[model samples]
Target: GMIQVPASFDIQGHRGCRGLLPENTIAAFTKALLLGVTTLEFDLVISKDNRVVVSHDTFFHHEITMMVDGEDVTEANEKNFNLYAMNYADIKEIDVGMKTHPRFKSQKKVPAVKPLFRELIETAEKLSAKIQYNGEIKSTVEGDNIDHPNIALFCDLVVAEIKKAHITDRFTLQSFDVRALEYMHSQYPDIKLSYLVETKGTLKKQLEKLSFTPAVYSPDVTLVSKKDIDAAHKLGMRVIPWTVNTKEEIETLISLGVDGIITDYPDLFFEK
Candidate 1:
């Protein structure tokens, strides 16, 4: 069964295929649909207008951002361009897709901006009704008031957007911040939540920190093993690993019984 596909496998596109297009834009998401991803895995930050915007960083990253007038963003200056400080219209002025990413060079550079969460959902459903979402909460303790919204407001805004779009059943809210998952489970118990871990640790420790079970467990690809998958499944949680981009790794994880794979290059799974 090594070459066989799982009956209900979820092939999620990381930031809508950041490996090929801009990380989290309408263009990248639309392309992911064309390439056949079941779930569009993305991140979120809020705008000054309280709109939940799809972006991996709370600020316009130096590597993927430019000023509204085509000026380059340097590492030092990028932190000043916080998304929380800008309205959606002003946030939309900067370009995210044109810069050649330092790591992902083959990405098609076009004019792109981080999209609104509802906008992405509406667009994707237009092209494919089955598209699911794995939207990450980019929250932190120290960044409580500056880099991003407080965890409570963040959750409220994100869930409001999800409810507004009526894709509650199709969305899995993910966060490395344990508090985010905990708060969501307490307030919105009906929503599916996923715990995101990038560090090396026992799954038990992470779940212990969470103190309650989540619907899914997502970790860095290198951090997962058969035991992790087995234990997660035993606990009624689905396992998915992030940022995997090779056919060998994807297939290996699939064989290990991962419920899904989050990949930047959704097309790499088909490599022969």
Candidate 2:
């Protein structure tokens, strides 16, 4: 006699409902929780003055952010715009939504400000009563201060912020930077980690390269298959695929046996 591994899966709302509202906005987050996402996946970057702020890119994507400090930044100087050089106080002064992101038109144009990670946690706790955060640390080692922190310091800073939030139970850290994940694991073992893979080579090779086992293995959804999913499960790591937007893709991932589907469209999960 055997028991079934529960087929009930986790659905992570990618960047707080990117398809329904502005990516990473408070409105988007609240709406995603209301839509019943079990997890909220977002990215974090540390500012020049040592403040942890929520954002995916190292610099504000010029296409989606303008009207900083009352000046339209559509064609504004890029040097004055990189988030790595800007303090959080200055970072918050810019409006991201009104600037027009071609990727997310449904994004509501709020004068959205970048928030501290603590703020996001507090707000999530208030709205849903409970929510898990799939937080990606957005530091590039290769970029090497051109954009954000170098990988080692970036990892340290992120772990520190998570501790500050008092949300060890509510969060998981992920990164494409192996050094970041490795350093984090050495210091904090109890916190779960996800290794993101986006380059060449087989999934097994990717895992081997990391040298430490991740609790969850997240792959770009389009790149995953049944064989890879099964292999991940065999290694005792759950497979969580990211950026699944359409209902068809959701169904396909579910059918192939992924542990979670990270998506921009929360409504797709609701339909199931």
Candidate 3:
């Protein structure tokens, strides 16, 4: 008998087609929808004045972020413009979209900046006529000083913003920070949760370390095994691996009963 679930597995475009386009840009998202992705994944960071913006890192990466006021900022200067202290208006002045990422050479050159989380939600809603968004909250312990909101604070901030956007059902909050996920579950249990696993350890080891279970357990695609996927399923957790771009890898993961594949190229996942 055939599986009752949809024959097509969930295809999530990581950072909205980042391998083919500038990550997290509205353009990339629009394109992902057109490519027929079931989910759109991205990160979130708060601007200085407490505005939640869609971005991948705490401090803007110089490799992809251009100068504000024509002054290039390095890792040394990254500490000075703390996201916690600056307002969104000032944060907008920095061009983050057009810079060339050596790894993603095909990325389109266009001026981009961190967009407010709500704005991205709104865009998703509009694109929802055809697609959906699976957001990654992106709070991290490493981002303390560069981006001040603690795990709990970050979770609250992003969750509150999602509610404000009225897209609670349209998205899921993901984090490698399980502590934050625990707090979020207690606070907003209804919100969909995804637990991101990135190291070389077993899923059970990672899950045991975390205080609670997530609706989705996302692992590094390369490290995912049949045992890992089945274990997560045994616990009623869906396995969704990240950043897969090649067809062979996608097929392999799909055969393993992974609920979804997060990729940088959504278009590659769709074809005749």
Candidate 4:
């Protein structure tokens, strides 16, 4: 038998409710748990110390970093503060929440810093009482060594942390990079995985990107259709879509029979 998630429809909070709280902070994750999310979806990048940090970008991007102590993070210079180059002690001092989030006006603006993946999971699990984790290993070919650790080290670090947390059974490791997926597939056999795809492409063509089917297929909200969902099901991969925020679209996707919805606005799942 396959390893299973909750039997009911899965509600995944993207970056722990980016629509309402600062993305990837303990504050946002706590808000998500309060909203009844079944899975907390956040991205992972490594510190030079090899600590797993919960953040969407390896370098604090211009849009998200808030200026502090007369130090500024601008589009021209943001990449200078690379998380992979910093130790976790240095990484936590950068404030990510005081600035306005261009797209999500409702995102609370408070002084916040990136939490270690371990801290995020433990904190959420305390309030969750029931919880699942979908942790994305953020990587890029262009920024490989500059922005992230070696892929093998990156994968093993995250896996070891999850094992240390004793949440291996409830965690779903995800990555858009096949390097991470392929490595994890060979090195860690039993961890459930989700392959994330963002391109506008056919299921057959996209599925070819991986040598083996993962436990879940997470694609862009716009990229999935009923036919694609059916095809994924036939392959024995559960289909879930990402970053869906509207009430109507979330409803339609649920009706289209997605196994889960990863959304910034989890409250929309309750709306009619």
Candidate 5:
């Protein structure tokens, strides 16, 4: 048997509703739970000191990241600071929440900081209820041995944090990097694995690249089709597409029989 998740259709809050709050902050995650999302989906990056931080980019995002000296980080200078190469103390001091998100102007700007993975999970545990965590390991080909640790070390670091939280049963480690997924499966098969697909290809072609069947098939919502959904179910895998924001898109994905929809607007799931 697989690890248990919320038994009904899953409403995963992407980056804890990035459109509503600062992405990957404790405030955003708490807001997602308050809105009744079944899963809290966010990305993970390892800091220079080997602390796991919840953030979408491997480095601070130029759009929202700010320096302790009160200067906004510009795209031209974004690459200068690597989150993996910086200490967690310095990374935490940068204000990631106050700036207006270019894509999400309506997002409530607050004084927020990127949190340690352990800290985020601890906050959730103090809440009135439980929510599943779908943590994505943010890694890339260029980052293999430079910005981030080697794949094995990366997996080990992430796995250690999840184990420390004592919520492994409710956690799913997902990634676009196949190496991370492969290592996780071999070392910790009991933990749920989700393969994130973004490239253009047949679903079979994508999953075939994996060493084993993942518990979930996560893809770009635009790429999902009835055939793909059906194929996944036949293999006992659940289909959950990402970053779906519009109400029209949510309903459309639901109609297509997706087991879950990951969205940046968690509140939209309940909106009439």
Candidate 6:
């Protein structure tokens, strides 16, 4: 008898194929579904009214965010539009898709807005039953209570939304914030968690910091190799590296035996 690799690799569309469409918008996710992504990867931040909005940054990034009065938001004014301080109504007024994303030249230019976390899930469920949501809680040590809710409250709000939609089994919560992971593990023990790593450290050291094993180990693609993947699998964890955009990088990561590759171009993940 021989050990077998899983039949399907987890092809996660980073921020819903951000290279193809505007990141974290409904359009991007819809496009990712069309490209046949196994998981829709996105980030979450709490609004002033406790609404969960799908976004990558706590404050609107000046590059993609445009003001309601036909003005582009600048870096100097970006912090003034802190998402946590603004209600969804105000947040919704800004257009995120019209501006040219400096890096993603092929990104389709269409009017779009940040969607409610539940809205994205519903859209995915309606579009395809096979797609799973890998929701990352966007929190930082300094911004924990300032730009977003506290760990427990943030986890509670996110879990409530997932439970309300009846998609706990279809969701995997990921976080670089260890406190968020600890709280999620302690409270919603059944929900699958992935420890997101962006730093260079031993797997054991990272897990020790988390104080528990995560269902998945997601690190920057640059930091992972066959040894790391093997080490992670030996510990009963799946290895999925993030934001691998180029074809060469994708092929290399897959060749290195990673269980999944998170890429901004989901189309690249599919063979032509």
**Which tens-of-lDDT digit does each residue in 152-198 have in candidate 2?**
67777777877876778778998888887888788888789999988
TM-score of each: 0.95, 0.91, 0.91, 0.94, 0.95, 0.95
Model 2: number of backbone collisions: 0
Model 5 stretches astray by more than 4 angstroms: 1-7, 68-71
- Candidate 4 least-lDDT 10 residues: 1-10
Q: Considering TM-score, which of the candidate structures 2 and 5 is the better prediction for this target?
A: 5
Candidate 4, residues 16-130, lDDT tens digits: the string is 9899888999998988888778899999999999999999998887788876335677888887778898999988988898889899998888889999998997897677656
The lDDT per prediction is 0.88, 0.79, 0.78, 0.87, 0.87, 0.88
Instruction: Flag the better candidate by TM-score, 1 or 4.
Output: 1
Give the residue spans of candidate 4 off by over 4 A: 1-7
Clashing pairs in 5: none
Error of 5 at 33 (Å): 1.0
lDDT of 1 by residue, 1-272 (tens): 23345988888999999999999999999988998788999999898889999998888898898664465688888887889989999888788988889999999999998889889988988897788999999998888888778889999999998898888999999999988898999999989999999886898887888878999999999999999899999999999898888777888898898999999998775544
* Model 3 clash tally, residue pairs: 1
Instruction: Choose 3 or 4, whichever is better by TM-score.
Output: 4
lDDT for each residue of candidate 6 in 128-205, tens digit (9 for 90 to 100):
877898999999889976799989899999999999888888799999999999999999998999999988788778
Task: List the lowest-lDDT window of 10 residues for candidate 5.
Answer: 1-10
Query: Tell me, what's the RMSD of every candidate?
Result: 1.8, 3.8, 3.0, 3.9, 3.8, 3.2
When 1 and 2 are scored with lDDT, the better candidate is 1
